[PDB]
Design a protein around this motif. Structure first.
Motif, PDB file in Angstrom:
ATOM      1  N   UNK B 125     -14.165  19.867  38.463  1.00  0.00           N
ATOM      2  CA  UNK B 125     -14.118  20.551  37.571  1.00  0.00           C
ATOM      3  C   UNK B 125     -12.611  20.918  38.863  1.00  0.00           C
ATOM      4  N   UNK B 126     -11.906  22.489  37.744  1.00  0.00           N
ATOM      5  CA  UNK B 126     -11.435  23.169  38.352  1.00  0.00           C
ATOM      6  C   UNK B 126     -11.780  24.749  38.884  1.00  0.00           C
ATOM      7  N   UNK B 127     -10.660  25.464  39.255  1.00  0.00           N
ATOM      8  CA  UNK B 127     -11.103  26.702  39.524  1.00  0.00           C
ATOM      9  C   UNK B 127      -9.457  26.985  40.262  1.00  0.00           C
ATOM     10  N   UNK B 185     -19.350  28.927  42.879  1.00  0.00           N
ATOM     11  CA  UNK B 185     -18.396  29.172  43.308  1.00  0.00           C
ATOM     12  C   UNK B 185     -18.641  30.195  43.665  1.00  0.00           C
ATOM     13  N   UNK B 186     -17.943  30.684  45.081  1.00  0.00           N
ATOM     14  CA  UNK B 186     -18.376  31.946  45.704  1.00  0.00           C
ATOM     15  C   UNK B 186     -16.835  32.374  45.630  1.00  0.00           C
ATOM     16  N   UNK B 187     -16.362  33.486  46.089  1.00  0.00           N
ATOM     17  CA  UNK B 187     -15.221  34.022  46.277  1.00  0.00           C
ATOM     18  C   UNK B 187     -14.757  35.629  46.700  1.00  0.00           C
ATOM     19  N   UNK B 188     -14.204  36.070  47.476  1.00  0.00           N
ATOM     20  CA  UNK B 188     -14.039  37.631  47.837  1.00  0.00           C
ATOM     21  C   UNK B 188     -12.823  38.535  47.349  1.00  0.00           C
ATOM     22  N   UNK B 189     -13.654  39.677  46.137  1.00  0.00           N
ATOM     23  CA  UNK B 189     -12.787  39.905  46.044  1.00  0.00           C
ATOM     24  C   UNK B 189     -11.821  41.774  46.391  1.00  0.00           C
ATOM     25  N   UNK B 190     -10.730  41.963  46.537  1.00  0.00           N
ATOM     26  CA  UNK B 190     -10.183  43.074  47.995  1.00  0.00           C
ATOM     27  C   UNK B 190      -9.721  43.586  46.456  1.00  0.00           C
ATOM     28  N   UNK B 191      -9.803  44.565  47.325  1.00  0.00           N
ATOM     29  CA  UNK B 191      -9.345  46.217  46.527  1.00  0.00           C
ATOM     30  C   UNK B 191      -8.597  47.075  47.719  1.00  0.00           C
ATOM     31  N   UNK B 192      -7.305  47.810  46.918  1.00  0.00           N
ATOM     32  CA  UNK B 192      -6.003  47.851  48.134  1.00  0.00           C
ATOM     33  C   UNK B 192      -6.210  49.293  47.258  1.00  0.00           C
ATOM     34  N   UNK B 193      -6.584  50.232  46.246  1.00  0.00           N
ATOM     35  CA  UNK B 193      -5.954  51.221  45.971  1.00  0.00           C
ATOM     36  C   UNK B 193      -6.219  52.125  47.018  1.00  0.00           C
ATOM     37  N   UNK B 233     -20.683  32.405  41.936  1.00  0.00           N
ATOM     38  CA  UNK B 233     -21.294  32.586  40.825  1.00  0.00           C
ATOM     39  C   UNK B 233     -21.821  31.217  40.758  1.00  0.00           C
ATOM     40  N   UNK B 234     -23.112  31.140  40.111  1.00  0.00           N
ATOM     41  CA  UNK B 234     -24.029  29.845  39.380  1.00  0.00           C
ATOM     42  C   UNK B 234     -22.758  29.048  37.965  1.00  0.00           C
ATOM     43  N   UNK B 235     -22.327  28.569  37.993  1.00  0.00           N
ATOM     44  CA  UNK B 235     -21.099  28.496  37.616  1.00  0.00           C
ATOM     45  C   UNK B 235     -22.188  27.056  36.112  1.00  0.00           C
ATOM     46  N   UNK B 236     -23.183  26.866  36.499  1.00  0.00           N
ATOM     47  CA  UNK B 236     -23.937  26.046  35.708  1.00  0.00           C
ATOM     48  C   UNK B 236     -23.975  26.921  33.657  1.00  0.00           C
ATOM     49  N   UNK B 237     -24.109  28.506  33.798  1.00  0.00           N
ATOM     50  CA  UNK B 237     -24.325  28.374  33.235  1.00  0.00           C
ATOM     51  C   UNK B 237     -22.792  29.587  32.207  1.00  0.00           C
ATOM     52  N   UNK B 238     -21.573  28.989  32.968  1.00  0.00           N
ATOM     53  CA  UNK B 238     -20.498  29.110  32.194  1.00  0.00           C
ATOM     54  C   UNK B 238     -20.224  28.664  30.484  1.00  0.00           C
ATOM     55  N   UNK B 239     -20.109  29.359  29.931  1.00  0.00           N
ATOM     56  CA  UNK B 239     -19.805  28.868  28.243  1.00  0.00           C
ATOM     57  C   UNK B 239     -19.495  30.333  27.663  1.00  0.00           C
ATOM     58  N   UNK B 240     -17.926  29.704  26.605  1.00  0.00           N
ATOM     59  CA  UNK B 240     -17.531  30.415  26.015  1.00  0.00           C
ATOM     60  C   UNK B 240     -18.293  31.778  25.558  1.00  0.00           C
ATOM     61  N   UNK B 241     -19.131  31.780  25.041  1.00  0.00           N
ATOM     62  CA  UNK B 241     -19.485  32.601  24.697  1.00  0.00           C
ATOM     63  C   UNK B 241     -20.940  33.419  25.574  1.00  0.00           C
ATOM     64  N   UNK B 242     -21.627  33.066  27.137  1.00  0.00           N
ATOM     65  CA  UNK B 242     -22.937  33.690  27.820  1.00  0.00           C
ATOM     66  C   UNK B 242     -21.174  34.292  28.344  1.00  0.00           C
ATOM     67  N   UNK B 243     -22.199  35.475  29.533  1.00  0.00           N
ATOM     68  CA  UNK B 243     -22.033  36.437  30.939  1.00  0.00           C
ATOM     69  C   UNK B 243     -21.642  35.118  31.358  1.00  0.00           C
ATOM     70  N   UNK B 244     -21.002  36.095  32.970  1.00  0.00           N
ATOM     71  CA  UNK B 244     -21.263  35.828  34.202  1.00  0.00           C
ATOM     72  C   UNK B 244     -22.232  35.744  35.035  1.00  0.00           C
TER      73      UNK B 244
END
Ligand SMILES: *[C@@H]1O[C@H](CO)[C@@H](O[C@@H]2O[C@H](CO)[C@@H](O[C@@H]3O[C@H](CO)[C@@H](O)[C@H](O)[C@@H]3O)[C@H](O)[C@H]2NC(C)=O)[C@H](O)[C@H]1NC(C)=O
Ligand SMILES: *[C@@H]1O[C@H](CO)[C@@H](O[C@@H]2O[C@H](CO)[C@@H](O)[C@H](O)[C@H]2NC(C)=O)[C@H](O)[C@H]1NC(C)=O
Ligand SMILES: *[C@@H]1O[C@H](CO)[C@@H](O[C@@H]2O[C@H](CO)[C@@H](O)[C@H](O)[C@H]2NC(C)=O)[C@H](O)[C@H]1NC(C)=O
Ligand SMILES: *[C@@H]1O[C@H](CO)[C@@H](O[C@@H]2O[C@H](CO)[C@@H](O)[C@H](O)[C@H]2NC(C)=O)[C@H](O)[C@H]1NC(C)=O
Ligand code: SC3
Ligand code: SC3
Ligand code: SC3
Ligand code: SC3
Ligand code: NAG
Ligand code: NAG
Ligand code: NAG
Ligand code: NAG
Ligand code: NAG
Ligand code: NAG
Ligand code: NAG
Ligand code: NAG
Lengths: 728, 728
Positions: B125-127, B185-193, B233-244
């Protein structure tokens, strides 16, 4: 043995050169600042009375940067809060004082951050610019009436110039002109909407945590230029509940057709105004004399009142077309234009006739027209002794071009060969200003019989001081290049030993219409280098230099960086043959165009110069501004002059710097020749594997003129030269 | 006769040091690039086979900058169009290549300008991050699933770090972490506003008519900092018409209460993740181990699973708190922390208990934990021979901490004293990497027997080429300063005559936890200075230096510019007394913090140093970034540490520069230590009337590393040093 003129002597101005600045206010009286107060002199007798006691300045709560008395003498503006912008522009705060009541107006004050302000030619009206819009105050104490509404920061300027117009076109920030009697207020609007922005960092005081980015609409060569609109406002109807009555005058169709510049405005009579326009190309200008139509408020132009002026060999005028000088009644005017032979001379024009008649001629040039009466025309020229670096005042009889007398030529022939003049209101009196070759000398004269009247300032103090110092001597001479006689000057070390081989420093400008060789007396860095360091300093005016005819000046048209660079080399080669010159130690330096020429010379691979210093140099013409650059180079497109823009860069000669020792200096806040120019040149040199030295000057602009930066650069340059010349 | 090691030898890397880079892909196999082929090696029996023939690369159609094979070995990623950004960040284009059908995926290709990309830890899998948003591709040939919608240039960063997190926290651009089996898939979000922008000019290629302005959200000391959010993120539910499906984990209350930083992430098992956070003050950090609740999808935090680490004498960790190394089950972990004596050692923690037990102890420190199995922990420390600048690999038995073996200490005691290691999966094999004092040596070993198996690279070729050159020797020893022994090293010219007096160059870093004295073999500028110019080059680690306990390291807490600067001076004073040093010729130079110390030293007025060179130095702490600066200085407020921020500037010492020859160098596009720092420093020197030398490097960054700039700066510094030392 005495002492020498030292670097510190130069840097701290230990030897004061006095002058005498006066302001004529009538045909026979002038204001002069003496011991902080404004005195009123009566040229005729020499008796003076006080016009404003120093006391009044003290009672103000600030330092008075400048003052301006109203024409009727009832008011005086006090300028303070001075904040420099570019070369001529700045903002300030102003206070209006009442000379009658001897009080200070306090109601309806001039706004903070005023950009420009001026009294009307008569009475005491006021027009000023604030936030890029024009305002008028008919009376000091009354409220102002807004004249324009389009003003917008960095976009629309009303009443003041944008960057390029201030620096390259008007050489002034102002773009407001009152009619002779105050009825009309003419102004120009500049639109920089599409002009690209030059951006650079400004670090400011150490306390600023994040640098500031300065942005200036600045048109580089070939880019979109600001557009202009000229209007004449009828001030008679200015009323709080009234609209503004103004009329837009457009240029004649032969210029309106494409990009153009407004280059001059001259009021002829209350109902006649002369506009001078030039095409973007700058080899075609036209004067349009417009007359006011009382029944419609329009300003009318006619083909018979239009006068064209072109140049097939170059550009028009020296840095812009010369200005028209109209007679009292406005039916004719005198203006300087190029001869059939290429020499700038005074021509007489009929306002409504195309053919003009030259009233002066010769293998020399008129510098400018200083005054005009019904009977005479006074002008400055370099005719005397055929030396182009000399200047004298002449008076020619209007009803007989045979009668021309030189008013300054023989006054003090050995001491004074370079003059400028300032005439009283109807040319009844004039002050003569002698700038050399001897110490400056200021004197007053009566136009009636040209009597000397009296000395205003003779610098006797400086003279006493200098006799105890080993000063260098300045000599002017000529050498022949490609069959032409060109002038040069050499500043020679004291007690000159013909048997010694002196190192030689070439100081260069060499830009189009430049003149580095003249008889002006100067206490400069070179004075120090010659007096203390025994370095001969010389300058040379070759192809491209001015005041010697268009054949010489226009020689570099469309090819900047060629013949003027080449002549500096050939002239130096000749100097290097002189027995008292050490041909193995020749350096060259210059600022601005002079830095560009210095760099092109060092990159020439001539083997003639050991080292050199370029200060704030142009390195590539496409980086310089549109107005100046295009005037000589046309547009950087393959359809025009692109090939010559591409092979005249300093970067193209990078490989050749491996042969010399180079010092590149630039102020980081240079809004004129952008730091970018040196940044790009240092990069090409680094890419070429060429070693050299640099020195940036943080926050300094094109003049690197703050007190400390000024001391620092000359001190740094002196060490570099001494190292290059093996001087202890 | 013999050649010496020249400037050109250094600049052009004539003498090449070889290495052996491998990538473990299982417990006994590793990939290796040889002759442009990718080879697959078997550590067991040493045999090898071709994994990808170089023919493939030739058929691609672009320079392959790098590649990454999928964990299941079915695909390989090809990185091309590499464009660097900051120290670790860059963007590229990527092709996915199918190894089974040896064909290139051409459907749903990875976009150009991708900012980061990584295979999952198992499978293929790729991210990847593009335009500041995360995307996941379950299959190389399938369309990706967008994970975030908040991505925004210069404002919001998902999956990658902003400028300060990249440079000072993660020392990486990446901010996403797949779970061991690819479920989450864990990830951080940075806000530089609210982070202010540093702005500077980039001139680019000579053809760019107008310079561009670079703008980077960069927080200077005490300024508004980026904020961060962490999600799984639980990547198991990733689907074209599904939410994250995602869950945000917030820090514990003790850190959540004010400004903080996420400083580390460690997956423990598929259902347990460890987050390490630190307060903006950085003397307080906490580890929060979170468990996945299958019935609700949330990640739960508990006080019993939180572990606090603080420092009362300075900051936590060396440049960040040390990372936890969990057992396979995740019930306990091992982590380096300061013990009761101020020495950093390995402590064993129970995941749900607060007390820990130290497994290492002594007047030395553990550098890092390298690998962990059910029975042994492998680590690197400087215990051997008590020399802090040495590094060895040790193995400690988990059920009996008194049982520790040094695996590298005696393999080659004379040649190898500085090691790093890389273990295969399950630590069955390890490559040992010896960096000095002799020539680098790479070996492969078996963990079961600790047998050497084989030499991967011994640099015998370099050894041969060097036998013909007059190489300098490097000597390490000790001196006492204020009752404490500190280490120093000297690079000595060939044929070092103890009787002659040599000039001395001090090369300094001296920043907090720095180590300039070690047993690493280096072919450097200094090598050339000793070998060819006969200059002794020395370095000294004094107060503030690392790897010698907190008493030494924390000595400069809240007072940068004091003791570490003074220690450089006193150590040199002692060096100057050794007899073989020409005290009339001592200099100092450094880059970054070293450029700062070099300047503070020159500005000390010690009379010890004749000259110095500072490259891209910090000149005032308030100008440097928040994360690094505050770690050691606190806040620049009168409530906190302003007094020490204010009197620690180089500018406050300007007056003392009049006694020394100084060269200040800086790249104009330095995004790390802004050009502004040297620009404010030079302005202060000019203001004080100090002459000095400068050198800007157009468009170069903090490394001044472009090929031509690199050669230019060292050539320029050599000339300056040689002139300072009267060396022809
Ligand atoms: C693609 O792969 C082949 C190998 O399958 C590469 O051929 C190999 O190229 C190397 C490098 O030139 C040759 O090594 C040389 O050996 C001599 C020792 O006698 C040494 O003096 C050189 O320094 C170098 O080590 C190697 O012999 C050769 N092997 C084979 C089987 O021909 C080929 O170069 C690769 N293609 C490209 C363009 O990278
Ligand atoms: C300044 O010049 C610009 C042209 O560069 C004028 O802008 C145009 O204005 C007209 C009418 O408002 C619009 O239809 C165009 O779209 C505008 N063009 C651009 C480039 O904006 C502007 O009106 C001028 N301003 C003044 C005071 O004359
Ligand atoms: C740019 O190129 C032109 C044309 O090649 C150069 O002009 C020539 O200069 C040489 C001197 O080295 C003369 O002998 C030729 O007669 C010139 N030719 C023309 C067309 O006039 C010009 O010097 C170059 N410009 C620069 C700054 O190097
Ligand atoms: C900033 O000021 C402090 C306080 O004066 C300096 O620290 C002192 O330094 C002197 C001389 O080295 C010592 O004798 C004192 O004991 C120190 N006092 C304290 C309380 O530390 C400090 O050196 C200055 N910083 C810089 C960079 O000059
Ligand atoms: C020439 N002229 C004007 O005179 C003028 C104007 N804009 C205004 N005002 C702007 C806001 N207040 C009301 C209008 N006036 C002044 C004015 C117009 C008509 C009657 C009386 C006063 N503009 C844009 C303009 O170009
Ligand atoms: C030495 N030097 C110059 O060179 C120079 C100059 N004045 C000009 N121009 C006219 C005024 N406004 C634009 C410039 N230049 C020529 C120049 C300056 C900078 C870059 C390129 C050309 N002066 C008064 C001068 O002394
Ligand atoms: C977590 N999550 C999401 O998943 C999400 C989302 N925004 C979207 N879409 C943006 C444009 N298309 C429709 C909504 N989705 C995807 C989605 C939501 C609900 C059902 C199916 C797909 N945001 C902002 C979000 O935070
Ligand atoms: C010489 N020198 C340094 O000085 C240095 C450094 N690494 C750092 N810091 C940690 C990693 N990234 C941020 C900086 N600094 C200290 C420093 C650099 C620039 C300005 C102020 C301090 N390295 C690896 C180095 O070799
Ligand atoms: C004002 O003028 C008097 C002479 O009239 C002079 O002595 C005095 O110095 C002046 N005041 C100053 C110092 O401005
Ligand atoms: C000069 O003196 C004359 C008297 O001869 C007088 O009329 C005149 O106003 C005076 N002018 C000034 C300004 O002193
Ligand atoms: C102008 O308009 C203002 C409106 O407030 C009014 O007060 C003023 O009297 C007007 N001027 C005249 C007298 O027309
Ligand atoms: C004026 O300059 C332009 C260059 O843009 C040129 O093409 C045109 O021919 C010139 N006109 C004259 C009179 O030389
Ligand atoms: C090495 O040899 C073993 C058996 O001897 C074999 O199973 C293995 O695949 C070989 N490894 C490689 C990559 O050649
Ligand atoms: C970023 O932070 C600002 C406050 O500084 C906030 O208004 C904005 O909504 C935040 N954006 C996101 C996506 O978190
Ligand atoms: C997703 O929805 C689109 C239409 O919005 C549809 O074409 C597609 O078949 C759907 N995919 C799935 C997995 O159901
Ligand atoms: C951490 O730093 C803060 C602020 O500088 C300080 O007040 C506090 O005492 C420190 N904490 C410890 C445990 O030393």
């Amino acid at each position: 043995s005495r002492r020498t003129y030292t670097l510190t002597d130069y840097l701290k101005s230990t030897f004061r050169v006095k002058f005498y600045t006066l302001q004529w206010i009538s045909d026979h009286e002038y204001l002069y600042k003496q011991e902080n107060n404004i005195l009123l002199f009566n040229a005729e007798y020499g008796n003076s009375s006080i016009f404003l006691e120093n006391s009044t300045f003290d009672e103000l709560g600030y330092s008075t940067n400048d003052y301006s008395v109203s024409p009727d003498r009832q008011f005086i503006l006090f300028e303070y809060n001075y904040v420099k912008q570019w070369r001529h522009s700045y903002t300030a705060s102003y206070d209006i004082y009442d000379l009658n009541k001897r009080q200070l107006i306090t109601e309806e004050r001039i706004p903070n951050n005023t950009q420009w302000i001026t009294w009307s030619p008569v009475g005491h009206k006021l027009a000023y610019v604030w936030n890029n819009d024009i305002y008028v105050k008919n009376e000091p104490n009354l409220s102002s009436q807004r004249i324009t509404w389009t003003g917008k920061e960095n976009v629309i300027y009303n009443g003041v110039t944008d960057w390029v117009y201030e620096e390259e076109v008007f050489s002034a920030y102002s773009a407001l002109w009152w009619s002779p009697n105050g009825t009309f207020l003419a102004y120009a609007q500049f639109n920089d909407t599409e002009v690209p922005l030059i951006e650079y960092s400004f670090y400011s005081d150490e306390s600023l945590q994040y640098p500031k980015t300065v942005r200036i609409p600045y048109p580089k060569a070939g880019a979109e230029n600001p557009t202009v609109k000229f209007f004449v406002v009828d001030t008679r109807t200015l009323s709080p509940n009234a609209s503004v009555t103004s009329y837009q005058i457009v240029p004649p169709a032969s210029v309106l057709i494409g990009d153009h510049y407004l280059c001059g405005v001259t009021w002829v009579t209350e109902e006649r105004i002369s506009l001078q326009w030039i095409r973007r190309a700058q080899n075609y200008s036209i004067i349009d004399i417009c007359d006011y139509d009382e029944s419609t408020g329009r300003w009318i132009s006619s083909v018979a009142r239009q006068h064209i002026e072109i140049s097939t060999t170059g550009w028009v005028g020296r840095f812009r077309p010369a200005e028209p000088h109209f007679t009292s009644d406005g039916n004719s005017f005198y203006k300087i234009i190029s001869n059939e032979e290429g020499y700038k001379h005074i021509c007489h024009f009929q306002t409504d006739k195309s053919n003009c008649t030259f009233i002066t001629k010769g293998a020399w040039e008129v510098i400018g027209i200083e005054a005009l009466t019904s009977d005479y025309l006074y002008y400055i020229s370099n005719e005397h002794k055929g030396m182009p670096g000399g200047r004298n005042l002449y008076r020619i009889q209007l009803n007989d071009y045979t009668k021309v007398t030189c008013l300054s030529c023989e006054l003090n022939p050995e001491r004074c060969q370079y003059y400028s003049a300032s005439f009283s209101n109807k040319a009844k009196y004039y002050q003569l200003r002698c700038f050399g070759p001897g110490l400056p000398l200021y004197t007053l004269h009566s136009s009636s019989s040209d009597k000397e009247l009296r000395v205003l300032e003779d610098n006797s103090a400086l003279d006493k001081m200098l006799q105890d110092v080993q000063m260098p001597s300045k000599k002017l001479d000529v050498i022949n290049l490609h069959g032409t006689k060109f002038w040069y000057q050499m500043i020679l070390p004291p007690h000159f030993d013909k048997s010694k081989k002196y190192p030689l420093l070439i100081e260069v400008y060499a830009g189009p219409c430049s003149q580095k060789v003249d008889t002006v007396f100067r206490l400069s860095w070179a004075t120090y280098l010659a007096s203390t360091e025994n370095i001969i300093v010389a300058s040379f005016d070759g192809r491209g230099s001015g005041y010697q005819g268009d054949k010489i000046m226009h020689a570099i048209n469309r090819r900047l960086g060629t013949f003027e660079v080449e002549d500096q080399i050939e002239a130096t080669r000749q100097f290097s043959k002189m027995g008292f010159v050490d041909d193995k130690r020749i350096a060259i330096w210059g600022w601005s165009y002079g830095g560009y020429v210095t760099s092109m010379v060092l990159g020439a691979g001539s083997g003639v110069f050991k080292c050199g210093i370029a200060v704030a140099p142009v390195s590539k013409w496409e980086y310089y501004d549109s107005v100046y650059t295009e005037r000589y180079m046309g547009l950087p497109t393959p359809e025009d002059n692109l090939d010559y823009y591409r092979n005249s860069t300093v970067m193209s000669r990078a490989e050749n710097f491996k042969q010399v020792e180079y010092l590149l200096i630039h102020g980081t806040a240079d809004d004129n020749v952008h730091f970018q120019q040196s940044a790009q040149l240092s990069k090409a040199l680094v890419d070429a594997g060429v070693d050299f030295q640099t020195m940036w000057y943080t926050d300094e602009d094109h003049g690197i003129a703050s007190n400390m930066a000024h001391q620092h650069i000359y001190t740094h340059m002196s060490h570099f030269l001494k190292q290059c010349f093996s001087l202890p």
